[PDB]
Paper text:
The structure of the blue laccase, a multicopper oxidase from the white-rot basidiomycete fungus Lentinus (Panus) tigrinus, involved in lignin and xenobiotics biodegradation, was solved at 1.5 Å. It exhibits a molecular architecture organized in three sequentially arranged cupredoxin-like domains; each of them has a greek key β-barrel topology, strictly related to the small copper proteins like azurin and plastocyanin and common to all the members of the blue multicopper oxidase family, like the ascorbate oxidase and the mammalian ceruloplasmin. Of the six putative N-glycosylation sites (consensus sequence N-X-T/S) only at Asn54, Asn376, and Asn435 the density maps indicate the presence of glycosilaytion. The structure is further stabilized by two sulphur bridges, one between Cys85 and Cys487 from domains 1 and 3 respectively and the other between Cys117 and Cys 205 from domains 1 and 2 correspondingly. The T1 copper ion (occupancy 0.75) presents a planar triangular coordination with two histidine (His394 and His457) and one cysteine (Cys452) residues. Exposing LtL crystals at pH 8.5 to high X-rays radiation doses under aerobic condition allowed us to detect two intermediates in the catalyzed molecular oxygen splitting, most likely corresponding to the 2-electrons and 4-electrons reduction stages. The electron-density maps from LtL disclosed two different T2/T3 cluster-dioxygen arrangements in the two laccase molecules (A and B) present into the asymmetric unit, possibly corresponding to two different reduction states of the oxygen molecule along the reduction pathway. In both molecules the T2 copper center is coordinated to His64, His397 and one OH- ligand whereas the T3 copper centers are coordinated to 3 histidine residues each (His111, His399, and His451 for T3(a), His66, His109, and His453 for T3(b)). It should be noted that differences observed among the structural data of multicopper oxidases published to date, and acquired using synchrotron radiation, are difficult to interpret since they most probably represent pictures of the copper sites resulting from the average of the starting oxidized state and of the partially/totally reduced coppers/dioxygen adduct states and strictly reliant on the acquired x-ray doses and on the other experimental conditions.
Author numbering: 1 to 498
Amino acid sequence: AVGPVADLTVTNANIVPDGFERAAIVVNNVFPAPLITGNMGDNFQLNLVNQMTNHTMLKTTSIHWHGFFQKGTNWADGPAFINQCPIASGNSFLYDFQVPGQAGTFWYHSHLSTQYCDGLRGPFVVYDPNDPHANLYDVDDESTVITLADWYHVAAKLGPRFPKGADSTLINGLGRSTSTPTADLAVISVTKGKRYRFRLVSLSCDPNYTFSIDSHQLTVIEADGVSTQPVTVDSIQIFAAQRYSFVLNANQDVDNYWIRANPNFGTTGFADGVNSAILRYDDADPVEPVTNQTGTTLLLETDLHPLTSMPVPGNPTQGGADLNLNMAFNFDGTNFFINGESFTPPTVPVLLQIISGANTAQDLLPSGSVYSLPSNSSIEITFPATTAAPGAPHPFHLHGHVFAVVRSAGSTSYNYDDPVWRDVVSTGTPQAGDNVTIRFQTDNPGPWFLHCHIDFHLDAGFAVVMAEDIPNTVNANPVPQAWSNLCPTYDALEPSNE
Ligand SMILES: *[C@@H]1O[C@H](CO)[C@@H](O[C@@H]2O[C@H](CO)[C@@H](O[C@@H]3O[C@H](CO[C@@H]4O[C@H](CO[C@@H]5O[C@H](CO)[C@@H](O)[C@H](O)[C@@H]5O)[C@@H](O)[C@H](O)[C@@H]4O)[C@@H](O)[C@H](O[C@@H]4O[C@H](CO)[C@@H](O)[C@H](O)[C@@H]4O)[C@@H]3O)[C@H](O)[C@H]2NC(C)=O)[C@H](O)[C@H]1NC(C)=O
Ligand SMILES: *[C@@H]1O[C@H](CO)[C@@H](O)[C@H](O)[C@H]1NC(C)=O
Ligand SMILES: [Ca+2]
Ligand SMILES: [Ca+2]
Ligand SMILES: [Ca+2]
Ligand SMILES: [Ca+2]
Ligand SMILES: [Ca+2]
Ligand SMILES: [Cl-]
Ligand SMILES: [Cl-]
Ligand SMILES: [Cu+2]
Ligand SMILES: [Cu+2]
Ligand SMILES: [Cu+2]
Ligand SMILES: [Cu+2]
């Protein structure tokens, strides 16, 4: 692990995580990117050193630290053309921020076009030295982080605009494709009698995964950075960019057990050990499992509740917030729309537009994609599922905030008492008549992206910007010189160096 102070050097390399070799983007020479760690409240000084050469996978980059509120450091949040211009190859840029009040399981990824799919993605864990759940487990370290990643044999800018599924599922960077049925599988080691805090991180560009471990129950204790009341289940469905911690008690026989991560589409099931890894007890032989799934209980989001009381902003009725927004989805075969408008990156990043003086949603580009939020207010946003936006279930993500999921996918109820707080939520399906509904309070001035975290959909415009407390965006987020220099440098590049 690296951090809280570290250089992250981004290069291109040929890698073979599923036994097939392809050109990719790696960080500190590895895919997934290395685990970054620190403790609650730490100052992260993460110096991104960009050495990429491959124009097809994009030579410039910008990094988002997923789930961190970035209060007062909106310029460090990462979305290209929202919070910064991209960093040029041959240059470095220091992300310098703090994580007060947060501890949990996070990740980081390129936030320029679909670049994270080509490899710039990895896990990020912030430990709590006084973790209230510490008594539930014995081991919590780099060996208990479990990443899930969809992997494509053809690069993001070379394959279909909307891929049909991934070629392999990688668990801790390893997995099999149908064409590589003997590729090395990841091994997660446990010792009989010990309890483990496994930190499950979706690095997905698109599919959700139904995750389980043969013969072992999973006690979920955290969702998207926020500690929850414990819930014991057999399987977890984890959407793109979500995170869970669960406790596993290694109380079965010394043996090998399959870890299963079944995507919603693509190559499904487990023939020849695709979509699989190995839970290997110490003292077991180094062979593949032959275990079966026995689980029957899939985690419901409605059974997730915060460990500490987190009251829901606003009145306990539909439309009961100070500002109530609905996000109406559409699609034209190529581009996605929200309330009739498709997100194309503006030339000038939204934060720099505001610094220059834009002070209404309507003076901000792209046209009709930016929403002004008043400060110190409760906000309700609904994301009704609709057949007008193919690719459901769309997992939506709000930057700068956690939010209360008052109504979850697959449920018709509204919980204003103790809903889960998290940062990525499935918006469900039109068949179920879903109308996923979130609440949050505006205490964090800055433009914050709100978008589907299926990266192919984001790149096709499925996004809006929450311009929170416009009058104090500049006051709250003083910018460093290096940030002010990004756009002039970027805009002076040849297009082939983008
Ligand atoms: C900057 O980054 C980019 C993006 O990462 C790099 O792009 C790469 O460019 C190369 C050259 O244009 C592309 O090559 C194609 O490579 C594939 C696969 O190579 C081969 O595997 C073959 C086996 O057949 C396949 O089985 C695999 C699974 O094993 C399946 O994935 C696949 O569908 C086939 O069934 C084997 O025959 C080869 O010897 C090699 O191992 C080739 O299939 C493909 O071949 C052609 O297809 C084209 C049209 O697409 C056609 O013209 C040919 O006649 C033949 O049918 C190409 O050779 C890579 O796919 C690109 N990589 C990615 C990830 O998209 C770029 O190289 C990089 N720049 C630098 C300087 O490094
Ligand atoms: C909310 O109100 C408090 C007290 O008036 C003020 O300190 C704070 O800056 C306000 N929050 C925002 C985001 O404007
Ligand atoms: Ca292309
Ligand atoms: Ca036995
Ligand atoms: Ca036994
Ligand atoms: Ca527009
Ligand atoms: Ca204010
Ligand atoms: Cl703190
Ligand atoms: Cl806030
Ligand atoms: Cu993210
Ligand atoms: Cu984010
Ligand atoms: Cu989507
Ligand atoms: Cu984002």
